[PDB]
Design a protein around this ligand. Structure first.
Ligand SMILES: CC(=O)N[C@@H]1[C@@H](O)[C@H](O[C@@H]2O[C@H](CO)[C@H](O)[C@H](O[C@@H]3O[C@H](CO)[C@@H](O[C@@H]4O[C@H](CO[C@]5(C(=O)O)C[C@H](O)[C@@H](NC(C)=O)[C@H]([C@H](O)[C@H](O)CO)O5)[C@H](O)[C@H](O)[C@H]4O)[C@H](O)[C@H]3NC(C)=O)[C@H]2O)[C@@H](CO)O[C@H]1O
Ligand SMILES: CC(=O)N[C@@H]1[C@@H](O)[C@H](O[C@@H]2O[C@H](CO)[C@H](O)[C@H](O[C@@H]3O[C@H](CO)[C@@H](O[C@@H]4O[C@H](CO[C@]5(C(=O)O)C[C@H](O)[C@@H](NC(C)=O)[C@H]([C@H](O)[C@H](O)CO)O5)[C@H](O)[C@H](O)[C@H]4O)[C@H](O)[C@H]3NC(C)=O)[C@H]2O)[C@@H](CO)O[C@H]1O
Ligand SMILES: CC(=O)N[C@@H]1[C@@H](O)[C@H](O[C@@H]2O[C@H](CO)[C@H](O)[C@H](O[C@@H]3O[C@H](CO)[C@@H](O[C@@H]4O[C@H](CO[C@]5(C(=O)O)C[C@H](O)[C@@H](NC(C)=O)[C@H]([C@H](O)[C@H](O)CO)O5)[C@H](O)[C@H](O)[C@H]4O)[C@H](O)[C@H]3NC(C)=O)[C@H]2O)[C@@H](CO)O[C@H]1O
Ligand SMILES: *[C@@H]1O[C@H](CO)[C@@H](O[C@@H]2O[C@H](CO)[C@@H](O[C@@H]3O[C@H](CO)[C@@H](O)[C@H](O)[C@@H]3O)[C@H](O)[C@H]2NC(C)=O)[C@H](O)[C@H]1NC(C)=O
Ligand SMILES: *[C@@H]1O[C@H](CO)[C@@H](O[C@@H]2O[C@H](CO)[C@@H](O[C@@H]3O[C@H](CO)[C@@H](O)[C@H](O)[C@@H]3O)[C@H](O)[C@H]2NC(C)=O)[C@H](O)[C@H]1NC(C)=O
Ligand SMILES: *[C@@H]1O[C@H](CO)[C@@H](O[C@@H]2O[C@H](CO)[C@@H](O[C@@H]3O[C@H](CO)[C@@H](O)[C@H](O)[C@@H]3O)[C@H](O)[C@H]2NC(C)=O)[C@H](O)[C@H]1NC(C)=O
Ligand SMILES: *[C@@H]1O[C@H](CO)[C@@H](O[C@@H]2O[C@H](CO)[C@@H](O[C@@H]3O[C@H](CO)[C@@H](O)[C@H](O)[C@@H]3O)[C@H](O)[C@H]2NC(C)=O)[C@H](O)[C@H]1NC(C)=O
Ligand SMILES: *[C@@H]1O[C@H](CO)[C@@H](O[C@@H]2O[C@H](CO)[C@@H](O[C@@H]3O[C@H](CO)[C@@H](O)[C@H](O)[C@@H]3O)[C@H](O)[C@H]2NC(C)=O)[C@H](O)[C@H]1NC(C)=O
Ligand SMILES: *[C@@H]1O[C@H](CO)[C@@H](O[C@@H]2O[C@H](CO)[C@@H](O[C@@H]3O[C@H](CO)[C@@H](O)[C@H](O)[C@@H]3O)[C@H](O)[C@H]2NC(C)=O)[C@H](O)[C@H]1NC(C)=O
Ligand SMILES: *[C@@H]1O[C@H](CO)[C@@H](O[C@@H]2O[C@H](CO)[C@@H](O[C@@H]3O[C@H](CO)[C@@H](O)[C@H](O)[C@@H]3O)[C@H](O)[C@H]2NC(C)=O)[C@H](O)[C@H]1NC(C)=O
Ligand SMILES: *[C@@H]1O[C@H](CO)[C@@H](O[C@@H]2O[C@H](CO)[C@@H](O[C@@H]3O[C@H](CO)[C@@H](O)[C@H](O)[C@@H]3O)[C@H](O)[C@H]2NC(C)=O)[C@H](O)[C@H]1NC(C)=O
Ligand SMILES: *[C@@H]1O[C@H](CO)[C@@H](O[C@@H]2O[C@H](CO)[C@@H](O[C@@H]3O[C@H](CO)[C@@H](O)[C@H](O)[C@@H]3O)[C@H](O)[C@H]2NC(C)=O)[C@H](O)[C@H]1NC(C)=O
Ligand SMILES: *[C@@H]1O[C@H](CO)[C@@H](O)[C@H](O)[C@H]1NC(C)=O
Lengths: 173, 317, 317, 173, 317, 173
């Protein structure tokens, strides 16, 4: 994808994450765990549902048209009726195939985008208290129990509480 | 010790292959098909009013072939013509058959109003053993075969004004006898002429005498013509023989009606979209069932499958 | 103490809603409409040369209906046909009327050059009270109604070579008398024949005698035909009666001319794009005013509005 | 948007910024102020004007065509003339609606992109002298008067002048 | 001291200008043309089977103009009609010429099977000095000009059943004599009639006597008609004079064959795509050589060039 | 481009890089040198080849059609044959021009993307041992010989080996 997160610096997806599309796995003094991020999941789902709202259940009514099958050879007028229909079908077939290829490229990029946005947001929350290990994981340089992890996932982590502890551990030797 | 916090995304064990601008085959967590590729094999009789033609073409129901008497004055959103249909009346053709079929199909009605033309000096109601109705020699129900009376066929010059607020559609014909002798037996003179006109149109036909291959023992033929008469206009029929006269007019309407050739059975179900294969669901935007459609239908395309990704790239461990 | 430096973007109090691929309604700072939805209600007379047909159809101006004499030899980029137009000459029809109208409209000119056919043995310049010119019985200006001379109509066999460097368009007709008696009064014999030919084409017509509804007391009709004669070719007219002769030829050209049905008034203004509603601006790429257009026009679409974002997402406080 | 700046980590836009599309607000020892960034504003405007150059004032001339309204029933040839026109209109209507949806998606993304590019450029200029507060703002850890702010906006800020001061303040306790 | 590590991308001295959504002119490292703008100027004779018409139109090869005898029973994927082609037999026309040309072109074959009609009572094999074959007066090879025998032309009423498993295509005509005297010299009676019919179709023609401009001294004309006879159907020919009889039938097929007007020479080479300009390569998706194409061809567009970037933006020092 | 690397914070491209599309230039105690990055080059080439696979060598066969040139004036049916063809050509001409403009915009963005991804990956590898100078270059704060540079290009650089040295140099005074 164009951001380089999904199938990129995130090595692989998590089959064990079943309650969301994006989320957090942690390891701390109390154990290891997983939690889905609801806002990024919903942002991706909402955009894809916008595409589906454009495409599903939106057909046009047509009634009497031209004939499209013929039992007898006729020449000029029948040649034209067939050419008109073949022309129309080829143009709609082109539209359909291009639409799906374009939309699919965009869907892969927007889902990569949402993964990147969540990563960047988390990175900024941690300020000087953590370092990016390069694979979607942060090494957090302070004791960070379950409530602490939860404060990061919830966007209420106060980096100033832990900064002295974290700087001491980071800039050791 | 500290902690580790890892950001990630889900994956599934059963991903789906889709196409993109840069890749012909890439796996995503989920996708949905945009090309409807099946029908239920029957034409649902709701919401469109379906008229099953059974053994009758629309043109035969129009003229009044005896097996088509059940279709008199019927209406339809979609007339369904069956491949088993056959004609069983006097042999005829229609110059520009396709246009008459189209204009009647689009009108959606065989409502017919009788009119009294007062044919004086001729014999009315000619019949044929090629057109059996109730085990008796008959003729197209909406047509009137005039012949000589007392070996005279005095020239006809008949008016029928349109004093209604709607258009009238008249169907009439010319009889082409098989031989010059038949011309005399029927019309008591050698050369017939037909001139059917309004203020804004004229149609003059000359019979063409000669043998055509016999159908139900008839080497003669009738040729079918039509005339539309607007309100405030007049039908003027002027003929010295060979006229197959109208008995009245058809109401001609405008609307959403049509005709389709199909052998699919009619079912008691609901579907907006009809194809000759049967009704198809119309949730998807495209379909490859049939280029012939009626109703709120997906657009026909030459693709058997177009999968729209509905999830991220699937990246298993 | 230090400092804070914040990065940001503008916003507006009056944002505009647009559609995207993922959102049916998203607000941006500004947008521009891509569908032209109005006309000024008049057809601007620049830059295209407009000819207002007034009471005349193009075909009536071609044949020379007396109310159309002002149109002789005129030229146009766009001929405008009005719904009030009516015919006021001898009753006629044109087989394939739509094609003659189209080919004359596209040619853009009624320039007409008289030719001397030297009709010997017949009476020229027949007239009718159905076609009044200057309070006198007259006829189509470009047509020549020939009848018997001294109760003889000797067969005509007349040549007119095209020795020019351009194509000639000939308009001619056949008279269909109302009765066999009228046929005699006019042509002094019972059966007329017309054969109009070139080296590369032939047209043979037979008059069809009979009553049509009377128009300005005329139960007869004329049927209009046309013939194109290339340089180095010859017009050969061969007739034993019922010929409505040409008086010359029309120049036929190729170019950008056309015809449009409209009741919009003509104005003194400039606009590249004409619709039957009136001229429309052509800055936008699309329009929903009319599918009928002439000139440099936006493309007709079935959307009343398509707003193109011209600014970022609008995010107020 | 796909970068997550506009309607993202930038909480909202500035109705009070009227002389540009993107810009800087600062608070320092001398007060607080606002300045538009001309280069990023122009980059966004130029791209949108490129789209408008493709779309405005570019119509095609057509002259004699087919008839499209009919006073009498005719059948086969008229059915075909109507079907040809209906087919054409539906294809152009599809093109028009897809074009605008695609272009609008792209315009929202390219304007988000320009906001992100300006943020990243500023972040890199500050080197070790500032920290990203996560909301589009930098906490600058040294005295930074109006000329100093102006040197950042102009791209002439010399981070080495302030680095000793800033590191002392940043890595306190 | 330390180190510096710089990330970068390549650039080239000879970049290429392309168009994007936001920029009319932007330079990239490389691009490829998507519009084929040239042909090789000859039609490659592989893989499609080409038949060069030389001096013959397809219709003249069908009827059997003497210069076209080499085309008897030939087959083609693409028949190539040359602008130098000319007719050199009896003067004729074909009502709906374009349709007969189309249906024969699409069928791809002039295979012809003779049939014995057993014309009794008439003289067969009429010839003309307008149609020289081997320095002798002749006629269309596939047509049979019947005239009177012993100053009698007894009415013809001839059947030919289609007992084959394929459709038969019959070509026939009506002779229009220049004068009423010629009508007698040839058919020994004043008024000919032709009626050609099957169970499902009828065609009745009346000759139209009169002078047409002389071609190779002939003021008469033949008009060409055709009839398709399905298996199990019958051809019935009924005529009292002026019949130009068929000598048999053409096989009519369905497939991929066509016809093209071109003056390009035929070459010994391979190319899937043929235009009247010559064959063109078909690697690119679009072309601006000709809207007329045959085979696996790029799509015609009104652009002289469309460059697809195949590299990054080019940013020189 | 939408990431702001190519024609952005990378000042210009390298005409002297002839064996790849993206790469590294270094200066260290042993000299200065250049090396192409094969994976990012291949990622960009593969995507462009995907576009070309869609576009090159994929034409449709058509055989008998309608006539498109006419020697004689005919009116209604010929008007319709010409209008059908003109309609078709205009729609395909629109498709062709839009396709190329869209694809070219995307090709410029995806090649900018690959440059950005390589930059970000390298930045994350260096952890606390280097600083982003803002122009695509990293100042590396430790002795980094040719094998060391090669370990960065190969993705095997062990930042912990040099961290003490680099932190001492970075956070001087
Ligand atoms: C008192 C007296 O002496 N009066 C004189 C009359 O005799 C004479 O009338 C004519 O007499 C001759 C005698 O040889 C002959 O019978 C005439 O009648 C025709 O006969 C032929 C031969 O059989 C017959 O042809 C057959 O037709 C059938 C089909 O039959 C119908 C049908 O279609 O079912 C019967 C229908 O009633 C008739 N329809 C109408 C409206 O008249 C049609 C119609 O004629 C055809 O469909 C047109 O093609 O035919 C079958 O096709 C056989 O194969 C075929 O041989 C004709 O049908 C008979 N014609 C009529 C009109 O009945 C008889 O006219 C009189 C005038 O000559 O002079 C008196 O003085
Ligand atoms: C010296 C002598 O004795 N000579 C003999 C002649 O008498 C005789 O000539 C014929 O005489 C009879 C006598 O009964 C008759 O008058 C013939 O003239 C026709 O008369 C009918 C009846 O009135 C008339 O029909 C009326 O037509 C009008 C419309 O009139 C015009 C028109 O359209 O304005 C007049 C035009 O001049 C005429 N145009 C041309 C080119 O001739 C047209 C044209 O005839 C029609 O438009 C065709 O439909 O008609 C109106 O329609 C009324 O409703 C209708 O009743 C005919 O118009 C008269 N026909 C002509 C040609 O004038 C007269 O020929 C002669 C031959 O029989 O024998 C001599 O020995
Ligand atoms: C023993 C006896 O006395 N018998 C009597 C016969 O005399 C008489 O027959 C008729 O006699 C007259 C005498 O004046 C005349 O010769 C009739 O023959 C026609 O002659 C005209 C005048 O020359 C001629 O017209 C010329 O035609 C040529 C073209 O010639 C051909 C051609 O196309 O090459 C010759 C072909 O054989 C012929 N084709 C067929 C199938 O018959 C065609 C055809 O006639 C035309 O193509 C139709 O347009 O013509 C050229 O066009 C010149 O410009 C033109 O002047 C006719 O061609 C001759 N017609 C025929 C049929 O040959 C002759 O019939 C008999 C009956 O009246 O009575 C006996 O008692
Ligand atoms: C012109 O020629 C045609 C063809 O020969 C004549 O038509 C044919 O007439 C015969 C005799 O009436 C018909 O025979 C019938 O055939 C059925 C079929 O089984 C048979 O059962 C009957 O007992 C009867 O013999 C034949 O069908 C018919 N053929 C066609 C194709 O119509 C025609 O009569 C001739 N014209 C004139 C005016 O004589
Ligand atoms: C249309 O209908 C009118 C009816 O008025 C027909 O006009 C009539 O036609 C007949 C047949 O020709 C005429 O009879 C003829 O009378 C003359 C006069 O002596 C005579 O010479 C003929 O031998 C024949 O008997 C009749 O006069 C005439 N008018 C009336 C009032 O009957 C007309 O023929 C019809 N046209 C067509 C094409 O059907
Ligand atoms: C819906 O109905 C259409 C039309 O009946 C179906 O398409 C038709 O399918 C038949 C059966 O496969 C095709 O017939 C075959 O044609 C080939 C030559 O093309 C021939 O060799 C075989 O012997 C057989 O006759 C027919 O061509 C085809 N027609 C068209 C226009 O596609 C279609 O399959 C049906 N779809 C569904 C979902 O039921
Ligand atoms: C065949 O029948 C038609 C229809 O009856 C005949 O035409 C009609 O002829 C009458 C008598 O000339 C016309 O009457 C006129 O009507 C006007 C209208 O107000 C009146 O003011 C006059 O004083 C005059 O009485 C009538 O218009 C006309 N109708 C039509 C529809 O044309 C026709 O004459 C008959 N054919 C033959 C050959 O007799
Ligand atoms: C085309 O124009 C030519 C003019 O040359 C017409 O040919 C002429 O037609 C008339 C009428 O049939 C001929 O008169 C006839 O003469 C014979 C000979 O005795 C006689 O038996 C007839 O009763 C009648 O009087 C004439 O001879 C003939 N040629 C010339 C030089 O006048 C031709 O009829 C026109 N064709 C058409 C369709 O208008
Ligand atoms: C430009 O002119 C066109 C054509 O005149 C206008 O479209 C037409 O608008 C009229 C008036 O609304 C429509 O008539 C109405 O039709 C309905 C049934 O559809 C009927 O129930 C009403 O009583 C009335 O007759 C007409 O259908 C419509 N025609 C078409 C082809 O759309 C159009 O509104 C004008 N545009 C502008 C901007 O002036
Ligand atoms: C009806 O009029 C046409 C036109 O005048 C007559 O056709 C013309 O007939 C003459 C005399 O046979 C032809 O003359 C020939 O011209 C060639 C050309 O150089 C000359 O070399 C010969 O020696 C001969 O004199 C002329 O070609 C011909 N014109 C056309 C356009 O066909 C026709 O004969 C008349 N109809 C009747 C029935 O008389
Ligand atoms: C189609 O072919 C049939 C062949 O059977 C033609 O029928 C025959 O037509 C001739 C010509 O009219 C008839 O001769 C006539 O006989 C009567 C009886 O006396 C007489 O009054 C006439 O003067 C003439 O001599 C013949 O009887 C009739 N039948 C047969 C068995 O020959 C028919 O004419 C052809 N139709 C066409 C349009 O070519
Ligand atoms: C492939 O062949 C086509 C058709 O022959 C070529 O297009 C044609 O090119 C000729 C020569 O330039 C054009 O003729 C000129 O037309 C103008 C008016 O448009 C006139 O003023 C000149 O005197 C000359 O006659 C012709 O219009 C044009 N036709 C079409 C339909 O475009 C085409 O150039 C050839 N392409 C290649 C690559 O060989
Ligand atoms: C430019 O692109 C085309 C299409 O991929 C390719 O065939 C050609 O080799 C490229 N040129 C260079 C110099 O890479």
């Amino acid at each position: 994808g164009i951001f380089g997160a999904i199938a990129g610096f995130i090595e692989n997806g998590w089959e064990g994450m079943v309650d969301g599309w994006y989320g957090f796995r942690h390891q701390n003094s109390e154990g290891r765990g997983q939690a889905a991020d609801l806002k990024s999941t919903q942002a991706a789902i909402d955009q894809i549902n916008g595409k589906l709202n454009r495409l599903i259940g939106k057909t046009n009514e047509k009634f009497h048209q031209i004939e499209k099958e013929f039992s007898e050879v006729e020449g000029r007028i029948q040649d034209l009726e067939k050419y008109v229909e073949d022309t129309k079908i080829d143009l709609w077939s082109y539209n359909a195939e291009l639409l799906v290829a374009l939309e699919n490229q965009h869907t892969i990029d927007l889902t990569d985008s949402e993964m990147n946005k969540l990563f960047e947001k988390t990175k900024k929350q941690l300020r000087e208290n953590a370092e990016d290990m390069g694979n979607g994981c942060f090494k957090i340089y302070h004791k960070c129990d379950n409530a602490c992890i939860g404060s990061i996932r919830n966007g209420t982590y106060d980096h100033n509480v832990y900064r002295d502890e974290a700087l001491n551990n980071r800039f050791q030797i | 010790p500290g902690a580790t916090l890892c950001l990630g995304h889900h994956a599934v064990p059963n991903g789906t292959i889709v196409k993109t601008i840069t890749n012909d085959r890439i796996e995503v967590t989920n996708a949905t098909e945009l090309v409807q590729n099946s029908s239920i094999g029957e034409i649902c009789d709701s919401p469109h009013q379906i008229l099953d033609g059974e053994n009758c073409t629309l043109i035969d129901a129009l003229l009044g072939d005896p097996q088509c008497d059940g279709f008199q004055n019927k209406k339809w959103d979609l007339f369904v013509e069956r491949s088993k249909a056959y004609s069983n009346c006097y042999p005829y053709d229609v110059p520009d058959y396709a246009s008459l079929r189209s204009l009647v199909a689009s009108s959606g009605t065989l409502e017919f109003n009788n009119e009294s033309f007062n044919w004086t000096g001729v014999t009315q109601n000619g019949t044929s053993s090629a057109c059996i109705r109730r085990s008796s020699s008959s003729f197209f129900s909406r047509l009137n075969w005039l012949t000589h009376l007392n070996y005279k066929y005095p020239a006809l010059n008949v008016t029928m004004p349109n004093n209604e607020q709607f258009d009238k559609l008249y169907i009439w014909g010319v009889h082409h006898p098989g031989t010059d002798k038949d011309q005399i037996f029927l019309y008591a003179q050698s050369s017939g002429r037909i001139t059917v006109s309004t203020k804004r149109s004229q149609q003059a036909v000359i019979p063409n005498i000669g043998s055509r291959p016999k159908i139900r023992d008839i080497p003669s033929r009738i040729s079918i013509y039509w005339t539309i008469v607007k309100p405030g206009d007049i039908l003027l029929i002027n003929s010295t023989g060979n006229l197959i006269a109208p008995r009245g007019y058809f109401k001609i309407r405008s609307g959403k009606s049509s005709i389709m050739r199909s052998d699919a059975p009619i079912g008691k179900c609901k579907s907006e979209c009809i194809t000759p294969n049967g009704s198809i669901p119309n949730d998807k935007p495209f379909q490859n069932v049939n280029r012939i459609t009626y109703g709120a239908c997906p657009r026909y395309v030459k693709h058997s499958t177009l999968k729209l990704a509905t999830g991220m790239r699937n990246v298993p461990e």
